[PDB]
Amino acid sequence: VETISFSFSEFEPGNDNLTLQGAALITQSGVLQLTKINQNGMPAWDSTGRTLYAKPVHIWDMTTGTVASFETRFSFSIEQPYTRPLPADGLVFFMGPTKSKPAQGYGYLGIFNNSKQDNSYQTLGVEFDTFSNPWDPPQVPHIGIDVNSIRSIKTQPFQLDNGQVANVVIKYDASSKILHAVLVYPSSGAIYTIAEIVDVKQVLPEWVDVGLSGATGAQRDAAETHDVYSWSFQASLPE
Amino acid sequence: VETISFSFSEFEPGNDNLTLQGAALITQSGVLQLTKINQNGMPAWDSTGRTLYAKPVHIWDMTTGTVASFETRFSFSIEQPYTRPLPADGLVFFMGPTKSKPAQGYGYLGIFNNSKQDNSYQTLGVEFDTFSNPWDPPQVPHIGIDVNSIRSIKTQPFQLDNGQVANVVIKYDASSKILHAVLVYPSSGAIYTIAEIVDVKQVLPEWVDVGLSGATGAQRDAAETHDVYSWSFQASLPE
Ligand SMILES: *[C@@H]1O[C@H](CO)[C@@H](O[C@@H]2O[C@H](CO)[C@@H](O[C@@H]3O[C@H](CO[C@H]4O[C@H](CO)[C@@H](O)[C@H](O)[C@@H]4O)[C@@H](O)[C@H](O[C@H]4O[C@H](CO)[C@@H](O)[C@H](O)[C@@H]4O)[C@@H]3O[C@@H]3OC[C@@H](O)[C@H](O)[C@H]3O)[C@H](O)[C@H]2NC(C)=O)[C@H](O[C@@H]2O[C@@H](C)[C@@H](O)[C@@H](O)[C@@H]2O)[C@H]1NC(C)=O
Ligand SMILES: *[C@@H]1O[C@H](CO)[C@@H](O[C@@H]2O[C@H](CO)[C@@H](O[C@@H]3O[C@H](CO[C@H]4O[C@H](CO)[C@@H](O)[C@H](O)[C@@H]4O)[C@@H](O)[C@H](O[C@H]4O[C@H](CO)[C@@H](O)[C@H](O)[C@@H]4O)[C@@H]3O[C@@H]3OC[C@@H](O)[C@H](O)[C@H]3O)[C@H](O)[C@H]2NC(C)=O)[C@H](O[C@@H]2O[C@@H](C)[C@@H](O)[C@@H](O)[C@@H]2O)[C@H]1NC(C)=O
Ligand SMILES: OC[C@H]1O[C@H](O)[C@H](O)[C@@H](O)[C@H]1O
Ligand SMILES: OC[C@H]1O[C@H](O)[C@H](O)[C@@H](O)[C@H]1O
Ligand SMILES: [Ca+2]
Ligand SMILES: [Ca+2]
Ligand SMILES: [Mn+2]
Ligand SMILES: [Mn+2]
Fold this sequence. Notes:
Two copies of one chain form a homodimer. Chain A is mostly beta strands. Chain A has no helices and 16 strands. The interface between A and B is medium-sized, with 17 and 17 residues. Chains A, B: It comes from Erythrina corallodendron (Coral tree).
């Protein structure tokens, strides 16, 4: 049984277990800021940043047909300082081909290049979307399960508790093919749940990189923070 | 679309929207005590109690083949005062045939008569089991999804935060047939999740009673409290 796991209770600047891309940065206080924060302390628009674990994960094997079960937990906060324009764009936990670089920002969240359902993306993602694009349901923010497309196969609206810490748990059970996610805000006690059937063998390559990506808007001040405080992950490929 | 819903932020003694069975009682403080509490304030063993919503729920229709999606949320606390003997037995949210009366107590939780997988039970339940019976996994307590049997088709161990309030969310998506449940302890921030595929048409009758049931042990002092503070439910049969 191939098992892989990591747990960051906080982030250490300079650690070589995380690959920072784009605007992503680890502060001296141990916070992972996915998108840029200006010197005035305000979030910058037109910013895209990602953080990928430095080791690829064996998610499934063609030879045996076995598929791994996995679970990831992370805490983040989104702070929206301006009344107008509308804040954007969101953050997303994703799994895709190894050695990947940032894709298009804005509503594509740094992981897609367009709004098409393309099998060549080979990407699975759980988004926390803050801006309603034309391919989005009118309600924002919302949790969404993305399978080879920014056009989610399932969405769940949630109320943002501005600047408060949210706890996320995402679990994938290989035997049932159920991807289930939960978002909890300790501040208000709010609990949101979403689940859908996803056969990862039809989406992802055998080996994948796991990461977090965030993006701010295409127009001046259409922005918000995308700060991550902790992140853990475990995967077990049965054998 | 046939929709039904109810929300009890607290329980009112004497309300006629709830059918109390066995030991179940609503206190002056607004708490639903599923199992008996002695005059000394300690939980009594050999106690079984249930509470059913007074109106039956239309879960599916044979004529159209349509199935309802539903969600229930409730808060409860289990307090285990004795070091020995081991506490028992647990509580469970369930759906089954209308006009039902309490079944066997103890490890059967007031909803089953034996440990067999019998289609005649026509019962679906999400248990919070505190005692390991021979049909149980060794880890207790645990959340379990019960389909026509006390022998869960899926279990998830959890750590009890003695006497603290736990929040539960159970959701069933008819389109995907996924039953997903979440348990959160605000006191410690612990989050537990469990999900499984359940086609209710193969289990439940068209109309069902929804309720909560609790039970204490078969031997002296093998007991604990099973207090419920709030309970809400919504179901929508597509049409
Ligand atoms: C977070 O980052 C940390 C820093 O990189 C990770 O810890 C490193 O993990 C490396 C494993 O990938 C590990 O590398 C080995 O280091 C051995 C020597 O260092 C130890 O022993 C020294 C005394 O001999 C002692 O002074 C040190 O303090 C260490 O105790 C070395 O012998 C190993 O080489 C063998 O294996 C390689 C790979 O098969 C062969 O190429 C080699 O011939 C030999 O057979 C190995 O060396 C590494 O080999 C690959 C090469 O590219 C690297 O340059 C070379 O370093 C390394 O020791 C530790 N570093 C420290 C300070 O502990 C950490 O990984 C997790 O923790 C470690 C301990 C391990 O359990 C990993 O599996 C974990 O993932 C990262 N954490 C996470 C969550 O990612
Ligand atoms: C929690 O318990 C509450 C108390 O039981 C529930 O509220 C009751 O809900 C009853 C619906 O099942 C409802 O019953 C109707 O009452 C009508 C008369 O009362 C109203 O109007 C009076 C003036 O005329 C006024 O003084 C009262 O204060 C009320 O405003 C009555 O006309 C209705 O009868 C018609 O419909 C029945 C059924 O088809 C026919 O049989 C009848 O011929 C006529 O066509 C109806 O009466 C009830 O009929 C069935 C019979 O067995 C009953 O004895 C008889 O009462 C009742 O008014 C309210 N009571 C109060 C105080 O509001 C509550 O239900 C929820 O809220 C209500 C308002 C409704 O929206 C329900 O759908 C909700 O579920 C329970 N809550 C929950 C979550 O379960
Ligand atoms: O106004 C901000 C908004 O700008 C464009 O519409 C982009 O497509 C969106 O993703 C968002 O960034
Ligand atoms: O000791 C308590 C214990 O007693 C018997 O074993 C019952 O079968 C269990 O459900 C539990 O009540
Ligand atoms: Ca969007
Ligand atoms: Ca048991
Ligand atoms: Mn979206
Ligand atoms: Mn059990």
